[PDB]
Amino acid sequence: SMSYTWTGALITPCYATTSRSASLRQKKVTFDRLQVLDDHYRDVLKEMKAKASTVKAKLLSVEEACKLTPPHSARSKFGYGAKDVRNLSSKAVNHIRSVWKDLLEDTETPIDTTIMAKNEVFCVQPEKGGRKPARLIVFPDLGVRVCEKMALYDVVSTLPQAVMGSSYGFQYSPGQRVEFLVNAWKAKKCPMGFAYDTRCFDSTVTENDIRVEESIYQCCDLAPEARQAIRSLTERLYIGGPLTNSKGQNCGYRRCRASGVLTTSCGNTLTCYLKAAAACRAAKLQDCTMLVCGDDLVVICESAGTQEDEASLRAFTEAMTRYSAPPGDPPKPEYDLELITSCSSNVSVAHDASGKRVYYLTRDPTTPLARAAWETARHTPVNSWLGNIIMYAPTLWARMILMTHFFSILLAQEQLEKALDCQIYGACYSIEPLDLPQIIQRLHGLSAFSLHSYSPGEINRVASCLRKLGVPPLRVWRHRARSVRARLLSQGGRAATCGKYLFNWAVRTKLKLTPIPAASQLDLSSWFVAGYSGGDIYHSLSRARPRWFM
Ligand SMILES: O=C(O)/C=C/c1ccc(NC(=O)C2(NC(=O)c3ccc4c(C5CCCCC5)c5n(c4c3)CC(=O)Nc3ccccc3-5)CCCC2)cc1
Ligand SMILES: O=C(Nc1c(OCc2ccc(Cl)cc2)cccc1C(=O)O)c1ccccc1
């Protein structure tokens, strides 16, 4: 069937992407799907289902689902918003219960969704091609979104790890992700790795793929209401349904993956892993190790020879293509771990204070810098700069440019204690900048504060990027950081900890740096568990048992 059909009504609004480029994207994502399954597919599926059978899922109460709703989440068209939901207002709660009852009673009627163009900031690079069109977001009403959490929050948080095990990428912090990749690479006699990029993955997801995902969720121990809600949500929402623009006009119809449903990440991860694990068998790849994050797939295997590796890679592609997962860019075999770009990141190595080797994840900093620039210029709902500091804390660019620049602004605005929202693995987190030393110590280790001996390739990439974007050179940043550090140190408490730990690199005479005693208390239990892209998930960071002296 067609992934999408359009009435012709425009995708109306609500360098950066806008609704004007939405037409160009619609042409790309609108196509008929051709899917052929085989024995490898069926075998992998049964193996996945057997592991899913060990899961016991819980039905979330109305109160629990409401607290998971972001405060700025889209308002319902039924006279209430995210604030009313979080406060457990009578109107919001009564509507949610009516939506739930309707899922238990109605098993067939398609549920309405809103289609909208995403406004994301990308960089002005005219050296190769032109500006990329806006990505599209498809989401149901706020009421349907709360019910999705009640039925599937515990499923989508628990089931992917039980099924895929160590292959589930969202169970890893950036440090654990590097540990997984390095251990996998060094485990092979002669290693070969590749990244597989699917052209419009959400559009390649067929209605059978969605029914197959349900067959996996149905293996959980579920409360009868959860079982019926999952069944009704599959037929009425996940399989497809009608599209409505921001103005209320009928836009068309969807028969592929919705980007803004709770099961988007989980379903995409399961589907990608299933087709890839089956394709690995068809291509007859040796001792495979996979790492899957939604549509992002990386495979580390045992090399069979340059010509053989090229041949097996074409065979994997032909299998993936049959499964309705064709590539955008054809996959390339890599014989260095540092040469693999996975989740827009690559492995690099530095040294700690004692000269010991330390692996970390980095990336080209063009887009993180351009987005941080937009964020200082115009106040945005999500602060990509904060998330980049959290995720890329051990990197040369996040320490010298992002940390320095934003701590100087927070010092000037007297907003260090002010909690800001950032997206990590699709979920929204309300974090206070003062908590950054503690967070970094937990996700990356004490070493992240005393890392040095960066590679020539990494230094040159950071330096070239700064030149290309008109950003002052690294020496200017070291000078600015010494002032930021001094001002922070003088303020005491958590602010001094920010100066001492985050800007230790900026001083000629480096400090000892003992572990931060309060970092243990940080409740990070809901941090590197699962992916919730388009899931509309929110968590405010909390401290467990605070000591009076902290
Ligand atoms: O000795 C030498 O040979 C050269 C020395 C040298 C060169 C330039 C400066 N610039 C400055 O002082 C000013 N800009 C900055 O001190 C500045 C700070 C951050 C900047 C950023 C980002 C960096 C990441 C966090 C968010 C801000 C961008 N740009 C920045 C410029 C350059 C810019 O203007 N815009 C962009 C656009 C896209 C991407 C990055 C940038 C402030 C007043 C006058 C301009 C300072 C020293
Ligand atoms: O979580 C981040 N990005 C996402 C993602 O990460 C995969 C991934 C990327 C880099 C590392 Cl080091 C490790 C894993 C997979 C799915 C969804 C999202 C998302 O957009 O929320 C995110 C947040 C702040 C900086 C950078 C990335």
XYZ file of C-alpha atoms and ligand atoms in Angstrom:
624
model
C 0.000 0.000 0.000
C 0.950 3.713 -0.240
C 2.828 5.015 2.862
C 0.806 8.258 2.398
C -1.993 9.726 0.254
C -2.746 13.443 0.125
C -5.905 15.538 -0.402
C -3.649 18.430 -1.458
C -4.508 20.625 1.586
C -1.199 22.172 2.720
C 0.855 21.271 5.780
C 0.077 24.591 7.525
C 2.328 26.210 10.227
C 1.777 26.428 14.049
C 19.095 28.334 8.564
C 16.150 26.431 10.240
C 13.391 24.372 8.521
C 9.792 25.629 7.968
C 6.396 24.429 6.577
C 7.379 25.893 3.110
C 9.758 22.956 2.479
C 7.090 20.379 3.691
C 5.968 19.709 0.041
C 9.527 18.543 -0.948
C 9.594 16.047 1.960
C 6.057 14.684 1.125
C 7.324 13.740 -2.402
C 10.200 11.665 -0.845
C 8.181 9.797 1.871
C 5.131 8.970 -0.400
C 5.592 5.583 -2.151
C 4.214 2.034 -2.467
C 5.885 -0.683 -0.325
C 7.070 -4.081 -1.596
C 7.720 -6.573 1.236
C 8.715 -10.287 0.933
C 9.405 -12.348 4.100
C 11.523 -15.515 4.382
C 12.565 -18.277 6.823
C 15.381 -16.158 8.436
C 12.816 -13.385 9.195
C 10.327 -15.901 10.688
C 13.110 -17.625 12.713
C 14.432 -14.334 14.200
C 10.806 -13.246 14.984
C 10.106 -16.454 16.989
C 13.471 -16.018 18.841
C 12.490 -12.368 19.677
C 8.964 -13.435 20.815
C 10.428 -16.120 23.135
C 12.499 -13.427 24.961
C 9.432 -11.027 25.067
C 7.459 -13.815 26.861
C 9.601 -13.139 30.064
C 8.178 -9.545 30.443
C 5.466 -8.549 32.963
C 4.019 -5.104 32.098
C 2.090 -2.761 34.429
C -0.934 -0.612 33.624
C -0.084 2.979 34.690
C -2.737 4.821 36.782
C -4.231 8.089 35.417
C -2.054 10.000 38.009
C 1.154 8.229 36.855
C 0.543 8.906 33.093
C -0.365 12.592 33.739
C 2.955 13.176 35.601
C 4.808 11.790 32.500
C 3.198 14.486 30.262
C 5.543 17.413 29.283
C 4.281 20.812 30.641
C 4.466 22.354 27.119
C 2.957 19.277 25.367
C 0.327 20.181 22.673
C -3.124 21.163 24.049
C -6.080 18.848 23.452
C -8.787 19.982 21.021
C -11.237 19.044 23.834
C -10.833 22.134 26.070
C -7.744 21.325 28.173
C -3.940 21.447 28.010
C -0.774 19.890 29.478
C -1.042 22.021 32.692
C -4.646 20.798 33.324
C -3.395 17.170 32.788
C -0.435 17.525 35.254
C -2.728 19.189 37.879
C -5.214 16.268 37.465
C -8.067 18.707 36.650
C -11.609 17.279 36.487
C -12.077 18.138 32.756
C -8.704 16.574 31.667
C -9.122 13.434 33.871
C -12.804 12.858 32.762
C -11.842 13.191 29.093
C -8.855 10.780 29.470
C -11.170 8.152 31.112
C -13.684 8.599 28.226
C -10.830 8.070 25.660
C -9.725 4.918 27.563
C -13.315 3.523 27.757
C -13.611 4.215 23.983
C -10.412 2.171 23.303
C -11.888 -0.739 25.298
C -15.265 -0.508 23.468
C -14.279 0.575 19.905
C -11.751 -1.720 18.156
C -11.909 -0.458 14.529
C -12.537 3.333 14.044
C -9.297 5.129 12.981
C -8.193 7.839 15.458
C -7.362 11.344 14.145
C -3.751 12.696 14.088
C -2.120 16.092 13.383
C 0.542 16.440 10.667
C 3.136 19.274 11.048
C 6.580 20.278 9.750
C 9.391 20.207 12.329
C 11.415 23.453 12.853
C 15.006 22.279 13.276
C 18.198 24.299 12.835
C 20.804 23.057 10.300
C 23.936 24.726 8.984
C 24.387 26.888 5.849
C 26.827 24.590 3.935
C 26.589 25.398 0.146
C 29.843 23.445 -0.676
C 27.808 20.205 -1.280
C 24.118 20.281 -2.320
C 21.351 22.474 -0.886
C 19.137 23.063 2.228
C 17.336 19.966 3.622
C 13.484 19.991 3.747
C 11.588 20.004 7.086
C 10.944 16.570 8.668
C 7.263 15.731 9.297
C 5.658 14.948 12.703
C 2.391 12.896 13.053
C 0.802 12.808 16.546
C -2.619 12.065 18.149
C -4.602 14.276 20.591
C -3.401 14.854 24.229
C -6.128 12.485 25.548
C -4.986 9.591 23.303
C -1.347 10.359 24.324
C -2.124 9.921 28.089
C -3.955 6.582 27.319
C -0.900 5.407 25.268
C 1.200 5.831 28.469
C -1.298 3.926 30.650
C -1.248 0.917 28.308
C 2.306 0.920 26.858
C 4.718 3.029 29.027
C 6.001 -0.014 30.978
C 6.051 -2.111 27.756
C 8.207 0.323 25.674
C 10.566 0.847 28.708
C 11.111 -2.847 29.578
C 10.405 -5.029 26.486
C 13.144 -3.759 24.006
C 15.966 -4.685 26.481
C 14.448 -8.112 27.258
C 14.124 -8.929 23.519
C 17.316 -7.441 22.031
C 19.515 -7.652 25.155
C 22.835 -5.816 24.761
C 21.880 -4.849 21.123
C 19.365 -2.288 22.498
C 21.276 0.995 22.256
C 19.016 3.129 24.480
C 20.059 1.183 27.662
C 23.506 2.833 27.383
C 24.842 6.167 28.630
C 27.468 7.698 26.163
C 30.246 6.013 28.234
C 28.548 2.566 28.231
C 27.916 2.925 24.437
C 31.726 3.419 23.852
C 32.454 0.494 26.201
C 30.030 -1.744 24.207
C 31.521 -0.723 20.787
C 35.210 -1.092 21.842
C 34.612 -4.474 23.575
C 32.731 -5.694 20.442
C 35.509 -4.480 18.085
C 38.386 -5.996 20.147
C 36.414 -9.325 20.536
C 36.867 -10.051 16.777
C 40.097 -11.607 15.350
C 39.919 -9.255 12.318
C 37.027 -6.706 12.783
C 34.774 -5.087 10.132
C 32.024 -2.631 10.995
C 29.348 -0.808 9.011
C 26.400 1.527 9.539
C 23.160 0.823 7.659
C 21.078 3.825 6.652
C 17.478 3.167 5.563
C 15.876 5.674 3.148
C 12.726 7.152 4.946
C 12.556 4.332 7.600
C 9.113 5.414 8.986
C 7.653 5.139 5.434
C 9.251 1.642 4.878
C 7.381 0.393 8.010
C 4.401 -1.569 6.577
C 1.062 -2.345 8.304
C 2.298 -5.970 8.731
C 5.481 -4.683 10.492
C 3.140 -2.836 12.955
C 0.986 -6.012 13.407
C 4.287 -8.024 13.972
C 5.334 -5.440 16.704
C 1.919 -6.009 18.381
C 2.530 -9.797 18.238
C 5.734 -9.091 20.286
C 3.944 -6.745 22.852
C 1.154 -9.353 23.224
C 3.834 -11.796 24.646
C 3.932 -9.626 27.882
C 1.884 -10.474 30.949
C -0.768 -7.759 30.535
C -3.846 -6.666 32.442
C -6.975 -7.348 30.238
C -7.561 -3.566 29.749
C -3.886 -3.138 28.660
C -4.281 -6.112 26.222
C -7.470 -4.613 24.600
C -5.974 -1.060 24.597
C -2.841 -2.350 22.755
C -5.120 -4.224 20.256
C -7.352 -1.133 19.636
C -4.381 1.322 19.512
C -2.732 -0.906 16.820
C -5.765 -1.025 14.411
C -7.019 2.513 15.053
C -3.767 4.477 15.459
C -0.426 2.632 14.903
C -1.337 0.799 11.617
C -2.448 4.076 9.969
C -5.210 6.682 9.946
C -6.337 10.142 8.774
C -4.198 13.314 8.777
C -5.330 16.794 9.824
C -3.252 19.999 9.456
C -2.862 22.738 12.187
C -5.940 24.585 10.684
C -8.230 21.488 10.902
C -8.318 20.544 7.186
C -8.218 16.892 6.051
C -4.638 16.394 4.650
C -4.755 12.748 3.596
C -4.068 9.263 5.036
C -1.141 7.351 6.630
C -0.372 3.580 6.200
C 3.137 3.638 7.747
C 4.834 4.593 11.074
C 3.586 7.726 12.937
C 6.628 9.670 14.214
C 4.778 11.093 17.239
C 3.253 8.034 18.953
C 4.554 6.421 22.159
C 5.632 3.183 20.321
C 7.651 5.039 17.571
C 11.122 4.370 19.116
C 10.352 0.846 20.500
C 8.603 -0.261 17.293
C 11.356 1.169 15.062
C 14.066 -0.499 17.165
C 12.302 -3.924 17.115
C 11.565 -3.673 13.346
C 15.130 -2.532 12.482
C 16.692 -5.302 14.660
C 14.348 -7.984 13.197
C 15.047 -7.127 9.532
C 18.808 -6.630 10.243
C 19.257 -9.846 12.288
C 17.482 -11.773 9.443
C 19.549 -9.947 6.723
C 22.783 -10.920 8.635
C 21.797 -14.563 8.114
C 20.965 -14.130 4.376
C 24.364 -12.308 3.820
C 26.011 -15.060 5.894
C 28.030 -12.570 8.047
C 30.382 -14.042 10.706
C 30.042 -13.430 14.503
C 27.701 -10.376 14.248
C 27.284 -7.778 16.990
C 24.525 -5.215 16.432
C 23.727 -1.913 18.128
C 20.255 -0.543 17.283
C 18.729 2.931 18.245
C 15.450 3.232 16.336
C 16.317 3.331 12.626
C 20.079 3.696 13.464
C 21.918 0.376 12.952
C 25.648 -0.493 13.375
C 27.099 -3.994 12.778
C 30.515 -5.178 14.034
C 31.446 -8.566 12.599
C 34.349 -10.908 11.700
C 36.039 -9.835 8.408
C 36.091 -12.460 5.597
C 38.360 -10.469 3.211
C 38.025 -7.071 1.449
C 36.203 -8.601 -1.603
C 34.127 -11.011 0.590
C 33.090 -8.159 2.999
C 31.975 -6.031 0.012
C 30.012 -9.066 -1.379
C 28.320 -9.871 2.010
C 27.416 -6.140 2.390
C 25.554 -6.171 -0.982
C 23.785 -9.413 0.124
C 22.719 -7.773 3.453
C 21.341 -4.782 1.439
C 19.388 -7.088 -0.972
C 17.822 -8.882 2.076
C 17.013 -5.517 3.849
C 15.499 -4.258 0.548
C 13.236 -7.385 0.316
C 12.115 -6.787 3.929
C 10.978 -3.234 2.840
C 14.054 -1.423 4.276
C 16.111 -0.167 1.214
C 19.176 2.092 1.796
C 19.738 5.792 1.179
C 23.531 5.658 1.006
C 24.910 2.142 0.289
C 26.740 0.701 3.357
C 30.568 0.765 3.419
C 32.857 -1.679 5.257
C 35.169 0.036 7.799
C 38.330 -1.497 9.326
C 38.842 1.194 12.036
C 36.227 1.748 14.825
C 36.950 5.516 14.786
C 35.891 5.624 11.093
C 32.291 4.487 11.865
C 29.642 7.240 12.248
C 26.860 5.758 14.339
C 24.095 7.924 15.915
C 25.901 10.951 14.336
C 28.920 10.014 16.567
C 32.360 8.430 16.330
C 34.760 6.863 18.862
C 37.914 8.883 19.713
C 40.514 8.447 22.458
C 42.131 10.799 25.005
C 44.185 10.350 28.220
C 43.207 10.987 31.877
C 45.442 12.812 34.472
C 47.608 9.652 34.930
C 48.302 9.130 31.158
C 45.837 6.203 30.933
C 43.782 5.775 27.698
C 40.072 6.818 27.733
C 37.518 6.143 24.928
C 34.726 8.674 24.310
C 32.114 9.595 21.658
C 32.407 12.793 19.651
C 31.047 14.202 16.368
C 31.575 17.041 13.898
C 30.539 20.092 16.040
C 29.031 22.222 13.173
C 25.327 21.451 13.856
C 25.714 21.505 17.754
C 27.456 24.949 17.450
C 24.935 26.402 14.879
C 22.034 25.240 17.149
C 23.715 26.683 20.275
C 24.126 29.989 18.281
C 20.386 30.033 17.432
C 19.620 29.317 21.154
C 21.610 32.362 22.402
C 19.925 34.549 19.693
C 16.269 33.429 20.266
C 14.894 31.693 23.415
C 13.789 28.146 22.412
C 11.639 25.498 24.257
C 14.466 22.877 24.264
C 18.129 23.794 24.931
C 20.190 21.544 22.613
C 23.337 23.162 24.145
C 22.589 21.612 27.585
C 21.971 18.135 26.119
C 25.205 18.422 24.048
C 27.116 19.381 27.267
C 25.557 16.323 29.023
C 26.171 13.832 26.118
C 29.473 15.218 24.772
C 30.972 16.329 28.133
C 34.417 14.642 27.473
C 34.806 16.361 24.037
C 37.252 19.244 23.371
C 34.499 21.462 21.832
C 31.794 20.969 24.525
C 34.270 21.734 27.338
C 36.005 24.754 25.740
C 33.194 26.419 23.734
C 29.728 25.283 24.950
C 30.541 25.129 28.701
C 32.450 28.448 28.622
C 29.883 30.360 26.527
C 26.764 29.247 28.390
C 28.212 29.467 31.907
C 29.212 33.114 31.179
C 25.618 33.869 30.038
C 24.132 32.138 33.155
C 26.560 34.148 35.357
C 25.497 37.398 33.589
C 21.753 36.566 33.777
C 22.099 35.164 37.397
C 20.248 31.982 36.199
C 22.587 29.090 37.331
C 19.869 27.576 39.596
C 17.132 27.922 36.885
C 15.954 24.515 35.595
C 15.978 24.154 31.784
C 14.495 21.501 29.509
C 16.644 19.236 27.294
C 15.918 16.166 25.137
C 17.808 12.926 25.917
C 16.866 9.809 23.901
C 13.528 11.442 22.928
C 12.469 12.174 26.566
C 12.381 15.692 28.085
C 14.444 16.430 31.204
C 14.172 19.497 33.472
C 17.793 19.975 34.664
C 19.489 22.749 36.677
C 22.893 23.833 35.226
C 24.418 23.695 38.793
C 23.856 19.876 38.699
C 26.084 19.421 35.570
C 29.325 18.365 37.483
C 27.334 15.638 39.327
C 25.547 14.409 36.098
C 28.826 14.280 34.045
C 30.599 12.294 36.848
C 27.782 9.697 36.742
C 27.493 9.324 32.890
C 31.202 9.788 31.937
C 33.271 9.460 35.153
C 35.667 11.819 37.082
C 38.091 11.455 34.096
C 35.785 13.656 31.895
C 37.072 16.636 33.922
C 40.797 15.912 33.436
C 40.888 14.549 29.818
C 43.771 15.653 27.575
C 45.981 14.343 24.685
C 43.250 14.808 22.080
C 43.955 13.290 18.649
C 45.302 15.492 15.768
C 42.173 14.673 13.715
C 39.816 15.795 16.521
C 41.774 19.033 17.275
C 41.915 19.944 13.534
C 38.146 19.196 13.020
C 37.229 21.451 16.015
C 39.691 24.204 14.880
C 38.513 24.124 11.197
C 34.867 24.273 12.302
C 35.566 27.374 14.478
C 37.174 29.104 11.438
C 34.259 28.175 9.119
C 31.655 29.586 11.584
C 33.414 32.793 12.728
C 33.785 31.475 16.303
C 36.881 32.833 18.216
C 39.908 30.418 18.311
C 40.496 27.970 21.234
C 43.023 30.373 22.943
C 40.231 33.017 23.340
C 37.997 30.374 24.989
C 40.781 29.307 27.466
C 41.140 32.984 28.482
C 37.327 33.460 28.891
C 37.014 30.181 30.907
C 39.586 31.396 33.505
C 37.249 34.375 34.316
C 34.068 32.188 34.312
C 35.922 29.708 36.613
C 37.087 32.526 38.960
C 33.526 34.027 39.213
C 32.008 30.544 39.772
C 34.640 29.583 42.479
C 33.883 32.759 44.477
C 30.130 31.848 44.682
C 30.628 28.610 46.670
C 28.465 25.475 46.836
C 27.442 23.879 43.510
C 28.562 27.008 41.557
C 32.177 26.594 42.824
C 31.966 22.862 41.874
C 31.008 23.983 38.311
C 34.124 26.213 38.112
C 36.515 23.700 39.740
C 35.331 20.599 37.779
C 34.074 21.890 34.378
C 36.902 24.402 33.889
C 39.862 22.471 35.425
C 41.298 22.303 31.818
C 41.621 26.150 31.769
C 44.234 26.460 34.559
C 48.056 26.127 34.224
C 48.241 24.430 37.689
C 45.570 21.653 37.612
C 43.747 20.591 40.816
C 43.495 17.006 42.275
C 39.706 16.567 41.720
C 38.220 14.074 44.224
C 34.668 12.623 43.552
C 31.655 14.979 44.174
C 29.898 13.463 47.259
C 26.359 14.527 46.206
C 26.473 12.805 42.727
C 25.551 9.467 44.410
C 22.163 10.985 45.566
C 21.109 11.953 41.973
C 18.131 9.782 40.905
C 19.107 8.788 37.322
C 16.975 5.576 37.274
C 14.828 6.928 34.363
C 17.815 8.185 32.294
C 19.464 5.573 30.067
C 16.671 2.999 30.021
C 14.705 3.485 26.783
C 14.123 5.653 23.715
C 10.971 7.788 23.514
C 11.341 9.705 20.225
C 7.927 11.269 19.557
C 6.750 9.577 22.760
C 5.952 12.927 24.534
C 7.773 11.807 27.768
C 8.873 14.186 30.597
C 10.986 13.772 33.778
C 12.229 16.462 36.230
C 15.623 15.505 37.768
C 15.442 14.617 41.486
C 17.858 14.053 44.415
C 17.500 11.001 46.767
C 18.327 11.556 50.510
C 20.165 14.967 50.651
C 22.889 15.462 53.313
C 22.531 18.707 55.340
C 26.195 19.691 54.494
C 25.545 19.503 50.706
O 43.375 36.509 17.719
C 42.727 36.169 16.728
O 43.294 35.836 15.596
C 41.239 36.221 16.730
C 40.539 36.450 17.837
C 39.086 36.647 17.984
C 38.175 36.584 16.927
C 36.831 36.866 17.116
C 36.354 37.215 18.374
N 34.966 37.493 18.508
C 34.326 38.143 19.516
O 34.903 38.629 20.476
C 32.781 38.263 19.379
N 32.141 36.970 19.119
C 32.260 35.914 19.954
O 32.915 35.974 20.995
C 31.539 34.661 19.571
C 31.159 33.773 20.576
C 30.439 32.630 20.281
C 30.045 32.365 18.971
C 29.222 31.362 18.341
C 28.519 30.232 19.035
C 29.509 29.211 19.617
C 28.781 28.071 20.320
C 27.885 28.605 21.412
C 26.873 29.562 20.834
C 27.559 30.720 20.127
C 29.182 31.662 17.001
N 29.930 32.802 16.761
C 30.456 33.249 17.966
C 31.219 34.377 18.242
C 30.153 33.425 15.455
C 28.812 34.029 15.135
O 28.656 35.250 15.141
N 27.772 33.193 14.910
C 27.749 31.777 14.948
C 26.953 31.128 14.002
C 26.933 29.743 13.942
C 27.702 28.996 14.808
C 28.481 29.620 15.768
C 28.494 31.013 15.871
C 32.106 38.931 20.595
C 32.146 40.429 20.311
C 32.620 40.600 18.881
C 32.446 39.249 18.248
C 37.247 37.252 19.444
C 38.588 36.977 19.244
O 19.653 11.656 22.915
C 20.131 12.258 21.962
N 19.782 12.021 20.677
C 18.941 10.939 20.303
C 19.490 9.668 20.069
O 20.770 9.507 20.543
C 21.615 8.467 20.029
C 23.004 8.761 20.519
C 23.689 9.865 20.035
C 24.883 10.275 20.605
C 25.398 9.567 21.671
Cl 26.839 10.145 22.467
C 24.764 8.442 22.149
C 23.573 8.038 21.561
C 18.688 8.637 19.598
C 17.327 8.846 19.440
C 16.759 10.075 19.736
C 17.555 11.137 20.163
C 16.932 12.455 20.494
O 16.946 13.299 19.502
O 16.494 12.727 21.615
C 21.165 13.308 22.166
C 20.955 14.306 23.109
C 21.872 15.327 23.264
C 23.021 15.347 22.508
C 23.248 14.353 21.580
C 22.330 13.334 21.409
